[PDB]
């Protein structure tokens, strides 16, 4: 379509689809988690977010990104660490694993920040809209096939604070997006970014899926 977001909505309306697929979302959809594979997803956000940030970070200031850089309304580290202090204990930086599919992720986070960095919205688009569009869900699934006690911490990164509405935060958000000036041939290597993110997502659910099954 005319607006980069609604171009990149429909052109990754497929691999959304895959990503709904995947065995491990599938599996998740049907309120079929276990601690340890949520711990799993947790970890993975963590590191994830982690060189997502710095890469934010790196180019807050280019009109490439500047335009959706949201600091205040977006960061998550700081409620992953709250989470993964709860998940793993005290000493979670120490024992949270770091696999393959996480590292590849964090691979092209930072290929992209270093030098491509005209992609970088693709996979803030993809990462930040696919929690806050499922977030909520994925957070009740949780707390009712995770039991956890009234500790009242381990769901943080699904709450998003700084963002009175998440409706219109989207709006303000895809408005940014379209005002982000781009030729044709970035516009295009941005909506298959968005798909290379999409994949690398994918890739890391079979992962998670197969370490779980063992
Ligand atoms: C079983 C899993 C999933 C379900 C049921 C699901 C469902 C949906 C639904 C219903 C929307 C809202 C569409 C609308 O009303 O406009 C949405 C949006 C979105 N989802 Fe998912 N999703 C799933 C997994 C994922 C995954 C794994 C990712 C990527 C890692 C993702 C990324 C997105 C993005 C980027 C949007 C924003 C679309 C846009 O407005 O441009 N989703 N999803």
Redesign the pocket.
Known sequence: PQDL?EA??EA?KEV?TQ??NAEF??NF?KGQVTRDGFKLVMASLYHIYVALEEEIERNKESPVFAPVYFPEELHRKAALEQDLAFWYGPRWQEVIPYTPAMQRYVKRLHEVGRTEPELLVAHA??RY??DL??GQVLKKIAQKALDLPSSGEGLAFFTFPNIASATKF?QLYRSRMNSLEMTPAVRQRVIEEAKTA?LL?IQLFEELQELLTH
Do not use: V
Request: glycine share 6%; charged share 20%.
């Open positions: 977001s990149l909505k990754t959304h990503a709904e979302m599938r959809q688009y993809t809209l696919a569009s499922g989207k999409f997502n």
